[PDB]
Design a protein around this ligand. Structure first.
Ligand code: MG
Ligand code: MG
Ligand code: MG
Ligand code: MG
Ligand code: MG
Ligand code: MG
Ligand code: MG
Ligand code: MG
Ligand code: MG
Ligand code: MG
Ligand code: MG
Ligand code: MG
Ligand code: MG
Ligand code: MG
Ligand code: MG
Ligand code: MG
Ligand code: MG
Ligand code: MG
Ligand code: MG
Ligand code: MG
Ligand code: MG
Ligand code: MG
Ligand code: MG
Ligand code: MG
Ligand code: MG
Ligand code: MG
Ligand code: MG
Ligand code: MG
Ligand code: MG
Ligand code: MG
Ligand code: MG
Ligand code: MG
Ligand code: MG
Ligand code: MG
Ligand code: MG
Ligand code: MG
Ligand code: MG
Ligand code: MG
Ligand code: MG
Ligand code: MG
Ligand code: MG
Ligand code: MG
Ligand code: MG
Ligand code: MG
Ligand code: MG
Ligand code: MG
Ligand code: MG
Ligand code: MG
Ligand code: MG
Ligand code: MG
Ligand code: MG
Ligand code: MG
Ligand code: MG
Ligand code: MG
Ligand code: MG
Ligand code: MG
Ligand code: MG
Ligand code: MG
Ligand code: MG
Ligand code: MG
Ligand code: MG
Ligand code: MG
Ligand code: MG
Ligand code: MG
Ligand code: MG
Ligand code: MG
Ligand code: MG
Ligand code: MG
Ligand code: MG
Ligand code: MG
Ligand code: MG
Ligand code: MG
Ligand code: MG
Ligand code: MG
Ligand code: MG
Ligand code: MG
Ligand code: MG
Ligand code: MG
Ligand code: MG
Ligand code: MG
Ligand code: MG
Ligand code: MG
Ligand code: MG
Ligand code: MG
Ligand code: MG
Ligand code: MG
Ligand code: MG
Ligand code: MG
Ligand code: MG
Ligand code: MG
Ligand code: MG
Ligand code: MG
Ligand code: MG
Ligand code: MG
Ligand code: MG
Ligand code: MG
Ligand code: MG
Ligand code: MG
Ligand code: MG
Ligand code: MG
Ligand code: MG
Ligand code: MG
Ligand code: MG
Ligand code: MG
Ligand code: MG
Ligand code: MG
Ligand code: MG
Ligand code: MG
Ligand code: MG
Ligand code: MG
Ligand code: MG
Ligand code: MG
Ligand code: MG
Ligand code: MG
Ligand code: MG
Ligand code: MG
Ligand code: MG
Ligand code: MG
Ligand code: MG
Ligand code: MG
Ligand code: MG
Ligand code: MG
Ligand code: MG
Ligand code: MG
Ligand code: MG
Ligand code: MG
Ligand code: MG
Ligand code: MG
Ligand code: MG
Ligand code: MG
Ligand code: MG
Ligand code: MG
Ligand code: MG
Ligand code: MG
Ligand code: MG
Ligand code: MG
Ligand code: MG
Ligand code: MG
Ligand code: MG
Ligand code: MG
Ligand code: MG
Ligand code: MG
Ligand code: MG
Ligand code: MG
Ligand code: MG
Ligand code: MG
Ligand code: MG
Ligand code: MG
Ligand code: MG
Ligand code: MG
Ligand code: MG
Ligand code: MG
Ligand code: MG
Ligand code: MG
Ligand code: MG
Ligand code: MG
Ligand code: MG
Ligand code: MG
Ligand code: MG
Ligand code: MG
Ligand code: MG
Ligand code: MG
Ligand code: MG
Ligand code: MG
Ligand code: MG
Ligand code: MG
Ligand code: MG
Ligand code: MG
Ligand code: MG
Ligand code: MG
Ligand code: MG
Ligand code: MG
Ligand code: MG
Ligand code: MG
Ligand code: MG
Ligand code: ZN
Lengths: 14, 118, 59, 131, 204, 122
RNA sequence: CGUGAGGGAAAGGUGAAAAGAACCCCGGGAGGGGAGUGAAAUAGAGCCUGAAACCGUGGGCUUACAAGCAGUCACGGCCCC
RNA sequence: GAAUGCCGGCAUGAGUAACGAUAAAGAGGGUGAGAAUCCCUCUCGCCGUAAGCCCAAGGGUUCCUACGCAAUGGUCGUCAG
RNA sequence: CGAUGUCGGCUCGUCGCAUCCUGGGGCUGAAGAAGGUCCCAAGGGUUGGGCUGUUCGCCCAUUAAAGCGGCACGCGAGCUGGGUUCAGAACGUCGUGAGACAGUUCGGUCUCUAUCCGCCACGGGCGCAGGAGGCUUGAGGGGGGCUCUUCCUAGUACGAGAGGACCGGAAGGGACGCACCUCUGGUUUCCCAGCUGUCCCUCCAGGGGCAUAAGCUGGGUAGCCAUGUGCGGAAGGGAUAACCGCUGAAAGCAUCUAAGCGGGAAGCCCGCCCCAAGAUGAGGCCUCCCACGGCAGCCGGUAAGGACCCGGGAAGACCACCCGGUGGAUGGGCCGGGGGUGUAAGCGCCGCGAGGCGUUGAGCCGACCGGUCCCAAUCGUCCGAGGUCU
């Protein structure tokens, strides 16, 4: 494989 | 729930089912025997029975009624002149469905034949 | 949804146990009265074409 | 057994047989036995039969009338013992069986659509010529 | 404490004292006694009634021996009535008079696999305002790590109907003994053609 | 079948023409009012120089409804609108006459003042 | 693979010798069973050796009232030597 | 024996999701070892400022015919780019 | 910190009791009615709105009451995403500035597939020492449990008056629950009619496709339904809570207690409805088969029975369940009835004509109630006891 789909952002634990 | 409901859907919408029965009727009356799936056979039985009974009546109205489904004057003419007269004394049960032994290779469907009786 | 995933690999014991209910059942067969061939009940005989005692369709 | 027959048999002791036939569109007067503490009197109710739904003994018919400015509809069981009598007031010619549409009509427009049913008026008047 | 078997015929209404009366019509009689249950032999008391006669060409050998041991014709169904011991050998609708109050058991109509809303009248979800594929869903089923499980008996979807139901304190409106008919005011479980039990009421 | 937010025509000379039901005075949490039920409503529309004016929070009895009312004799009556008659805390009509027919149910509910004043009890 | 500059694999071995399996059988073929070759054919070309995970067939013991980091110690039953 | 290690192989999830527009099919006849799926006919439906026809770019034999069905075709295949 | 998603809402609840209501009490500065305060009680119940993202709170209209809390401030592999909590932009304020702010303002991507436990349902297997077809006992579970108004008692007891009961007895409600479809009211994908456009069959007339996965419009049976109908909460028995006692010492009196007995709650036990013998502690009763042939075991043919296969079903996802299989009405057709639509076509007459009238409540016509072997459930196959021991 060559291409990585970006991972989802996290839930903002702010 | 389906409680006390008559009539198969045959995974067709309302107008497709109708033409199925209509095209199956023209086929059966054109040839006298056809092979279909068992469910389609079991339902064509009453669709074709009624047309044949209207042909026993034999009036203009009946011909016009019958023509709504068969649309073919020559075939309707055969139904009224050759098919109906051999059922005059038969009170319904003009068709029959017999089940076949072998299934289709490509989808496993059970087949059966539908014919006009003697 | 949040994409449910298996938590452990299924053992050979658990996998096959789930297939406890997977055997084909053999087909129902009866001898045909006219030609004595074996065929499913309630079907026109595919070997001789007889059903209910009469030749129904040529084979 | 015959479940349909048994139902009829249970209903037969209550089935009425003395009322005039009428149709949606006919004007009609129902004399209805009504109670008011602690006596009972006869209150007429005149209007157009806008609907009749048939279920054997369980047929019921709806009559519509305006009344001191407000439209009032009433539903009667056709075999109710509370009905003293029914008088046929006017035979009306409808093209359909349920006349809900006259709820939104002016008086003059209802008259245009429900013109007098000549044929059944003559039927009435040609009856009542009897011994 | 009396009881009779029967069959739901269908509903209609009558007129009684210038009042409409919704009634179910039950064809109840006539039920032969086919076995009596004695405290000596069985430890309790009840009567095994039979109902609807049967073509013997369908009644098997061990069952024929049962009917014959009581000298009754083969019947289609057998049901007991607890603490009922009729003096005769045949129970009929003549055991119920108008004005009495009965309890009717029947097998309810079968909804099959029913949703949480049809079964338990759950509120469902919104149909707008961003609701996402949950309009008929049941919401939350639990808590979090405490208790970290779902209760036994938490209402969820599943089968619904085709089960034993009894309606209490039903008025008897009329009895027509010549046709074995029993007119009960109200509604009875199950479809027309279903088996029903009609017992005296346990209410006061 | 009257509930909060339902508008009723006003069947008397109180001066109010339209009221909007704001509570059904039939217990703790009744959902609907029918003929004979008292409601609390707001006057949304009234004629000039009335005994009542727009804004007043009044009590009313419902005298006729668009959902047909059923009756023990198996009959049923159904009007063209939802109408009400304005009353005082002692349930007497706050006007001096009533317009239109009214439901006979009002009689055995003790609204005999309205029943008499009405031109037709149906 | 990348527009391009550029990036950049995998893939060796029958047997001494093709003697590389005529011919027959089932089969549409593929594949197999015989026949034949060879010291050897689970050396038959998807070929030296042929481990492990993994999948199957057969057999011995065993299991449907039972609480489990799966073993360990004990005793008893059954099968083998 | 572990480096979310590197290469390879093989499991699990599982006979599960899916098989890519809800424009739609049915029958008879033929071919063939084999046919829902190929050919032929009748019926039915869909597009018709297109889902028809003609250029340009880009692609590069895909065109026609004969013989083929291991793989490619999301199933089948006697058909096919 | 190689991730434990954060407010409020919605949905679904469940528990606690320091009890908001309802039930039971003692004391009262308790006349009555109504309160106050404390005790017992967690069975059930605890409304609809305006404002704000709000929790909170205020307010409207009611109520028996409009209770406080735990469950990761319950619950985002259940939803929401208004607020918080990224990147844009603006205002006030701070900073020379870049920028900043528990200061404000407008906007701003929330992940189809459940492996294990758990939960709702439904089967398959084996077991329940002989094998079978029935009908049952109920160990143990589950469900339910709310409450108001008016009247009578009686304008009595009480009170100067206003006001106004206990106990006992009737009637009518709200919400909730289970079932039902007779009525009311929905739907009813082709059950009937009307209508436009277009293409077609066959020129007229009659019709068919398409305009949605019904072209549109007016209706609409069975089924499934609530807005509709029936019915439920109990009664009753028992044991108690706080509390009130009888007899009664220790302790010549007194004491509900130390011996002993009674009264006493919407609560506890039973009662009602439902599941229920895998209740392996595998229960009981009724009926049927039966000592089979060959070497507590094995292999054969059977018995009573069972399954397969088939026509079906208000039963159902598959499975299961239930009915039927020619000695038969199971489905399909036909016939009668119901029911819907609302007067077919053709012909005759009238009008120049669109039309109208008549034949005619005609024609068509799903499912409902029945009849009728006209068609199809043909013909068959396979399993299945020989009963261990004291
Ligand atoms: Mg990723
Ligand atoms: Mg559906
Ligand atoms: Mg049916
Ligand atoms: Mg499909
Ligand atoms: Mg269409
Ligand atoms: Mg028909
Ligand atoms: Mg057959
Ligand atoms: Mg078959
Ligand atoms: Mg094929
Ligand atoms: Mg989700
Ligand atoms: Mg999610
Ligand atoms: Mg999503
Ligand atoms: Mg899911
Ligand atoms: Mg997923
Ligand atoms: Mg697993
Ligand atoms: Mg494995
Ligand atoms: Mg294995
Ligand atoms: Mg293993
Ligand atoms: Mg498993
Ligand atoms: Mg599986
Ligand atoms: Mg298996
Ligand atoms: Mg029963
Ligand atoms: Mg429900
Ligand atoms: Mg619901
Ligand atoms: Mg909703
Ligand atoms: Mg969204
Ligand atoms: Mg979702
Ligand atoms: Mg949606
Ligand atoms: Mg749901
Ligand atoms: Mg959470
Ligand atoms: Mg836990
Ligand atoms: Mg069931
Ligand atoms: Mg104003
Ligand atoms: Mg104002
Ligand atoms: Mg008025
Ligand atoms: Mg490239
Ligand atoms: Mg290139
Ligand atoms: Mg390089
Ligand atoms: Mg070499
Ligand atoms: Mg070499
Ligand atoms: Mg060598
Ligand atoms: Mg050959
Ligand atoms: Mg070969
Ligand atoms: Mg071979
Ligand atoms: Mg070979
Ligand atoms: Mg050697
Ligand atoms: Mg070797
Ligand atoms: Mg070797
Ligand atoms: Mg070598
Ligand atoms: Mg090798
Ligand atoms: Mg190898
Ligand atoms: Mg093995
Ligand atoms: Mg145990
Ligand atoms: Mg064991
Ligand atoms: Mg352990
Ligand atoms: Mg030891
Ligand atoms: Mg190490
Ligand atoms: Mg490693
Ligand atoms: Mg990991
Ligand atoms: Mg790897
Ligand atoms: Mg795999
Ligand atoms: Mg599967
Ligand atoms: Mg899965
Ligand atoms: Mg699946
Ligand atoms: Mg998928
Ligand atoms: Mg699938
Ligand atoms: Mg796809
Ligand atoms: Mg795909
Ligand atoms: Mg597709
Ligand atoms: Mg279309
Ligand atoms: Mg056809
Ligand atoms: Mg073909
Ligand atoms: Mg093909
Ligand atoms: Mg093929
Ligand atoms: Mg296709
Ligand atoms: Mg072709
Ligand atoms: Mg055009
Ligand atoms: Mg266009
Ligand atoms: Mg290319
Ligand atoms: Mg070719
Ligand atoms: Mg190929
Ligand atoms: Mg091939
Ligand atoms: Mg090749
Ligand atoms: Mg392929
Ligand atoms: Mg593909
Ligand atoms: Mg292929
Ligand atoms: Mg192929
Ligand atoms: Mg070929
Ligand atoms: Mg080509
Ligand atoms: Mg952290
Ligand atoms: Mg990780
Ligand atoms: Mg982790
Ligand atoms: Mg993580
Ligand atoms: Mg995680
Ligand atoms: Mg809570
Ligand atoms: Mg306390
Ligand atoms: Mg209290
Ligand atoms: Mg008190
Ligand atoms: Mg007190
Ligand atoms: Mg006082
Ligand atoms: Mg007091
Ligand atoms: Mg409580
Ligand atoms: Mg609580
Ligand atoms: Mg509130
Ligand atoms: Mg507003
Ligand atoms: Mg607020
Ligand atoms: Mg605030
Ligand atoms: Mg109070
Ligand atoms: Mg939280
Ligand atoms: Mg909370
Ligand atoms: Mg949360
Ligand atoms: Mg989310
Ligand atoms: Mg949230
Ligand atoms: Mg969560
Ligand atoms: Mg999560
Ligand atoms: Mg936001
Ligand atoms: Mg938003
Ligand atoms: Mg960022
Ligand atoms: Mg500034
Ligand atoms: Mg500055
Ligand atoms: Mg800021
Ligand atoms: Mg602050
Ligand atoms: Mg601002
Ligand atoms: Mg915007
Ligand atoms: Mg914002
Ligand atoms: Mg989007
Ligand atoms: Mg994902
Ligand atoms: Mg799972
Ligand atoms: Mg687990
Ligand atoms: Mg089981
Ligand atoms: Mg037993
Ligand atoms: Mg118990
Ligand atoms: Mg247990
Ligand atoms: Mg008094
Ligand atoms: Mg005095
Ligand atoms: Mg009292
Ligand atoms: Mg209905
Ligand atoms: Mg009905
Ligand atoms: Mg209706
Ligand atoms: Mg209706
Ligand atoms: Mg209907
Ligand atoms: Mg039709
Ligand atoms: Mg024309
Ligand atoms: Mg047309
Ligand atoms: Mg066309
Ligand atoms: Mg078109
Ligand atoms: Mg159409
Ligand atoms: Mg309608
Ligand atoms: Mg319609
Ligand atoms: Mg009630
Ligand atoms: Mg004392
Ligand atoms: Mg004393
Ligand atoms: Mg004592
Ligand atoms: Mg006591
Ligand atoms: Mg006591
Ligand atoms: Mg109570
Ligand atoms: Mg039971
Ligand atoms: Mg049992
Ligand atoms: Mg136990
Ligand atoms: Mg047992
Ligand atoms: Mg079925
Ligand atoms: Mg059977
Ligand atoms: Mg048979
Ligand atoms: Mg039949
Ligand atoms: Mg029939
Ligand atoms: Mg008929
Ligand atoms: Mg009729
Ligand atoms: Mg009729
Ligand atoms: Mg006419
Ligand atoms: Mg005509
Ligand atoms: Mg004409
Ligand atoms: Mg002329
Ligand atoms: Mg008719
Ligand atoms: Mg007969
Ligand atoms: Mg045979
Ligand atoms: Zn044969």
């Amino acid at each position: 494989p060559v291409y990585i789909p970006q991972p989802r952002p996290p839930h903002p634990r702010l | 729930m389906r409680h006390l409901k008559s009539g198969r859907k045959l995974n067709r919408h309302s107008s497709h089912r109708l033409a199925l029965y209509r095209n199956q009727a023209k086929s059966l009356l054109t040839h006298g025997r056809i092979t279909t799936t068992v469910p389609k056979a079991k339902e064509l039985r009453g669709f074709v029975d009624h047309l044949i009974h209207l042909a026993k009546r034999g009036d203009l109205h009946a011909r016009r009624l019958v023509l709504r489904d068969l649309q073919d004057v020559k075939l309707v003419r055969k139904l009224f002149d050759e098919i109906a007269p051999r059922y005059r004394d038969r009170q319904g049960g003009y068709t029959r469905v017999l089940k076949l032994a072998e299934r289709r290779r490509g989808d496993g469907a059970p087949l059966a034949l539908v014919e006009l009786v003697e | 949804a949040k994409h449910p995933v298996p938590k452990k690999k299924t053992s050979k014991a658990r996998r096959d146990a789930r297939r406890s209910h997977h055997a084909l059942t053999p087909p129902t067969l009866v001898p045909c009265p006219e030609c004595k061939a074996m065929k499913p009940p309630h079907t026109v005989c595919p070997e001789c074409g007889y059903y209910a005692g009469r030749k129904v369709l040529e084979v | 057994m015959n479940r349909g027959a048994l139902i009829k048999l249970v209903e037969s002791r209550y089935v009425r047989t003395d009322l005039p036939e009428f149709r949606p569109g006919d004007t009609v007067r129902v004399s209805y036995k009504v109670k008011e503490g602690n006596r009972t009197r006869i209150q007429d109710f005149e209007g157009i039969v806008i609907r009749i739904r048939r279920n054997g003994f369980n047929t019921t018919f709806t009559v519509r009338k305006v009344s001191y400015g407000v439209g009032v509809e009433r539903i009667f069981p056709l075999h109710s013992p509370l009905i003293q009598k029914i008088d046929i007031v006017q035979r009306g010619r409808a093209r359909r069986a349920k006349l809900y549409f006259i709820r939104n009509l002016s008086d003059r427009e209802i008259r245009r659509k429900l013109r007098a049913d000549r044929k059944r008026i003559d039927q009435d008047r040609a009856a009542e010529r009897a011994a | 404490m009396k009881g009779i078997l029967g069959v739901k015929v269908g509903m209609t209404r009558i007129f009684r004292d210038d009042r409409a009366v919704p009634v179910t019509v039950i064809l109840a009689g006539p039920c032969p006694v086919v076995q009596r249950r004695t405290p000596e032999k069985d430890g309790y008391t009840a009567v095994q009634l039979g109902f609807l006669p049967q073509n013997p060409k369908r009644v098997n050998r061990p069952l024929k021996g049962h009917f014959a041991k009581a000298g009754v014709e083969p019947v289609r169904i057998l049901r007991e009535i607890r603490d009922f011991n009729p003096e005769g050998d045949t129970v009929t609708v003549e055991i119920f008079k108008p004005g009495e109050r009965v309890d009717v058991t029947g097998t309810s109509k079968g909804r099959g696999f029913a949703g949480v809303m049809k079964r338990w009248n759950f509120a469902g979800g919104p149909d707008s305002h961003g609701a996402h594929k949950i309009h008929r869903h049941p919401g939350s089923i639990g808590n979090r790590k405490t208790p970290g499980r779902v209760y036994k008996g938490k209402k969820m979807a599943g089968h619904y109907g085709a089960e034993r139901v009894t309606v209490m304190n039903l008025e008897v409106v009329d009895v027509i003994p010549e046709e074995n008919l029993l007119l009960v005011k109200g509604a009875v479980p199950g479809p027309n053609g279903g088996l029903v039990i009609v017992r005296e009421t346990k209410k006061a | 079948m009257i509930q909060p937010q339902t508008y009723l025509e006003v069947a008397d000379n109180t001066g109010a023409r339209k009221i909007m039901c704001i509570r059904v005075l039939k217990g703790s949490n009744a959902k609907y009012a029918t003929v004979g039920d008292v409601i609390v409503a707001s006057v949304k529309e009234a004629i000039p120089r009335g005994a009542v004016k727009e804004g007043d929070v009044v009590k009313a009895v419902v005298v006729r409804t668009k959902k047909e009312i059923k009756r023990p004799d198996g009959s049923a009556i159904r009007f063209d609108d939802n109408a009400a008659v304005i009353i005082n805390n002692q349930l007497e009509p706050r006007g001096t006459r009533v317009f239109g027919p009214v439901a006979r149910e009002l009689r055995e509910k003790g609204f005999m003042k309205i029943v008499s004043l009405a031109p037709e009890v149906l």
